[PDB]
Amino acid sequence: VMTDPIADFLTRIRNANMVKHETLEVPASKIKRDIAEILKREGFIRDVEYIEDDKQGVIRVFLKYGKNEERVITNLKRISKPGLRAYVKADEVPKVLNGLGIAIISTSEGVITDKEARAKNIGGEVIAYVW
Amino acid sequence: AVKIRLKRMGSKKSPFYRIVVADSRSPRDGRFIETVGTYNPLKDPAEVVLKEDLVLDWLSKGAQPSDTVRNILSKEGVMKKHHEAKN
Amino acid sequence: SRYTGPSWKVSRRLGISLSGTGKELARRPYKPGQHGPNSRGKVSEYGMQLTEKQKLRHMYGMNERQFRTLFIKASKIKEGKHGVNFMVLLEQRLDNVVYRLGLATTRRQARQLVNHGHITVDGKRVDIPSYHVEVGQVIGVREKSQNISTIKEAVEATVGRPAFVSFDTEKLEGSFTRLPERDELYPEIDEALVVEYYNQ
Amino acid sequence: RNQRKVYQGRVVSDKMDKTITVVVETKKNHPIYGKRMKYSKKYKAHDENNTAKVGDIVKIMETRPLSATKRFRLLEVVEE
Amino acid sequence: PTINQLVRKPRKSKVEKSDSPALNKGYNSFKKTQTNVNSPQKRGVCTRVGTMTPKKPNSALRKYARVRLSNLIEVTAYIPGIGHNLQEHSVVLLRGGRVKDLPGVRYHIVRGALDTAGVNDRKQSRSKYGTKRP
Amino acid sequence: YIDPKHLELEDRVVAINRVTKVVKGGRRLRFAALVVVGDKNGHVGFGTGKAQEVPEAIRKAIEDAKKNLVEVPMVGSTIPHEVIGVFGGGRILMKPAVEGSGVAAGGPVRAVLELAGVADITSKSLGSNTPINVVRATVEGLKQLKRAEEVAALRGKSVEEII
RNA sequence: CGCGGUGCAUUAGCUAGUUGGUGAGGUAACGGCUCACCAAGGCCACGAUGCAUAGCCGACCUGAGAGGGUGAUCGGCCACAC
RNA sequence: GACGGUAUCUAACCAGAAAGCCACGGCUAACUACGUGCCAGCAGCCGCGGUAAUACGUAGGUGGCAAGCGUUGUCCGGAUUUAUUGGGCGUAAAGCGAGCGCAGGCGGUUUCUUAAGUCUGAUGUGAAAGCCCCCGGCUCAACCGGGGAGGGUCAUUGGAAACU
């Protein structure tokens, strides 16, 4: 059965990105909305809209492509996993492709990017690398 | 008893000493309670560095200076402060 | 241990002039031995790295262990290029300082003067050719040794000095006023290849 | 005044008079692979009146050795 | 494997073994047992000195010595260099090292050590073959 | 497509391989040459050529390489970021290195990096060391390098906001 | 007293002062430390027990690191002296 | 004052007494002559030697290192060759012949809550010596001395609360 809805969300983006689909839909969750918002404001996706339904809601993601339909997202990697949770301390916060990518980190201050986490000088659970 | 004594250091033919508080039975270069100073005898005027409050505290507790350390403490004036503390 | 062998055959093994004059490469600009004049196969990249490293340590007349350890310390310098910082430390070697100031025509002669004790650092005798000279330290000839033809010939013979050196032809006392910059040292030496040599 | 160690655990044996066996059930990270592994450390506690029963949550505080294997004292019965 | 599997059955690596096992074992006369002592060489007595044939590509009469070591192990050793003064019941010093031609030979006899003589007429690589400078 | 003209490309023979076609009359031995070409200013290419003689094989390899030039992003003396190039067996890890640390690369990787103008870079070949595939793997990695300005433009950000 | 640092189940059973209690005695001291009684428990696949090996550590060698190897000299602790 | 007329210093005198070892077919920096002809021998691996061998032995050259140089033994590396970092299982080694299932591992959405995990602050402690960092002392270095830093899945305590 599905054991990692976050990894499912990242893979749905990766697979849709591979074939350059305009949009993508996923079952909603708070963490998935948090990740979608970070992709939105970091310039990796074009937009995100939310659909209220009867089960758990749906989040619609609008993928982003540049001139010549160059992919803005190269790939996404799940770091922390149900089988092996990954935690970093404030000084262990990773830099992804020397800052050209981002790491999404869950902290007691919320779900934030690697830039924000080391500004606040806090660590947490590393959710995903995005570049 | 508890001694304030010298621990030999440095190299062959070039001794350097730390002033340490140690149990009398511990080996000279072995176990010690606390470092309280240094003693460099190769200097024509001998160089001494001393944590006077640490030394003064241990003397009040009954620590027994070694013969040479007593001289070292007298030149630095600590043995006078201990004498005035007993008064 | 010092290398006391023929000097020319070392320069033509390296394809450069270690004296910086060229008299070693003027005649027979090829490797020593009977196989020198005629054509051989291409040097490997390891040979290219070996020869570049051998250029420097032959330049300053050091054995390999000392050369290795100096190269290790040059790494510890945090700011600047590893190879560049290495070349500077070779120059700051008291041997090289004596030769640069003009007190000897050859580095072997500069080493012979330092080793035998004719040189004084900040007024104090130093006989260690490996001694590392800071910027501003004064390097002079011993008051007993100032009147020897060998230094006086060298003092008058040398008509040029590196820009990073201060020298007084009367006191026979000089100093590096700053570190050498890469362009001021031997450009023909590719220090990048030395760094990669010891990287292997 | 200094404090002793107090652990929360579950009674797994009360077949001995005036004593209970407790399980603390912490979790430790594997030294190589980093996963969190379940770990059971169980203690013998002196039950003053055989109060706590099997399958009960109880708090125990450390004490001087009361027997060959007793080192802990029942403090509270948190759940029955 | 999954992480849980590695937790349950951790990684385990192949154990290496010596190329020259007879040099890894000492002998205790009192307890009459074998000690695990790594030794760079070992002394032994030549029980048999002769010549041997190589494997198929090569052909020669390779010179060996059947040596019983001080640790009681029985080993076949090779006599490097040209010409040798060994005979049965001679005391020889063995170093490690196979001889690719000889299937059963895992040790070389050190020249210039114990009863083994240096190589006659040798002039290059003398430190090997144990000959003094002429 | 990087136009070969207007560039002073240099050539480096990486490997010369003697290859055999078996024929009724025996064997037809030829030489297969792998050559890297580059301007040492950010453009590098590689090519292969086959001929009955080494000089002729190298010429064909050089001509092929010029037609297949690629540009490598470069921050100073090193690359913008870490990259893993994979092609077939070849698997090449390349990392940025501090200034002056040199080209810590082995085998054919050195030829590609030096002719591309990279002076300080750490790399490790993790897969097969067949020269053709490691060279191919290297360029696959270099083609994955991204410029901060291009990344920022694609994301609608200033280079400062990205970093 | 918590935690930590070897191999083997082609070693899974082990334990009977053993587990706990009640008194007594004993120790600088708590305690099956010992004893007399009354119960019967204790341990163990989170590796008991058995077997093999080993003094432990600060440290030392190596490695990009994660690690791997080692435990001379020096210092700490331990143990032993036919 | 054991060291001890020891370090050290000064003067005179002479280049005079003070270098080797291994390697040079490829890997691997360095090549030619003879001698030998699957012999004698070499060899870490691939492999050399069968009468024109840069691979055996000698010589001349040459390369590397140097009061050392080589050989053997042992450990780490290269070895991603046990892969946590960091590998695999259609045909190369590798999916149990298949199911049912105890324990275990993992597990959908969400409100409040807790806070064991996680993150973070402070204090205590993690001896000295050692590596490392500054700073001084020995003519330099080794070495020595001073001042730091580092090192814990440490404890106590105050916080945070997304994630488990």
Ligand SMILES: CN[C@@H]1[C@H](O)[C@H](NC)[C@H]2O[C@@]3(O)C(=O)C[C@@H](C)O[C@H]3O[C@@H]2[C@H]1O
């Ligand atoms: C029957 N004549 C044959 C026939 O022409 C072969 N080609 C099909 C031809 O092939 C050759 O030319 C080859 O290529 C090889 C050689 C063994 O025989 C040569 O001579 C071969 C000729 O002898």
Ligand SMILES: [K+]
């Ligand atoms: K009792």
Ligand SMILES: [K+]
């Ligand atoms: K022991």
Ligand SMILES: [K+]
């Ligand atoms: K005994």
Ligand SMILES: [K+]
């Ligand atoms: K050879």
Ligand SMILES: [K+]
């Ligand atoms: K893995």
Ligand SMILES: [K+]
């Ligand atoms: K099957």
Ligand SMILES: [K+]
């Ligand atoms: K918590």
Ligand SMILES: [Mg+2]
């Ligand atoms: Mg005095």
Ligand SMILES: [Mg+2]
């Ligand atoms: Mg020496």
Ligand SMILES: [Mg+2]
């Ligand atoms: Mg040889």
Ligand SMILES: [Mg+2]
């Ligand atoms: Mg093609």
Ligand SMILES: [Mg+2]
């Ligand atoms: Mg490694």
Ligand SMILES: [Mg+2]
């Ligand atoms: Mg060569």
Ligand SMILES: [Mg+2]
């Ligand atoms: Mg030969």
Ligand SMILES: [Mg+2]
């Ligand atoms: Mg490994």
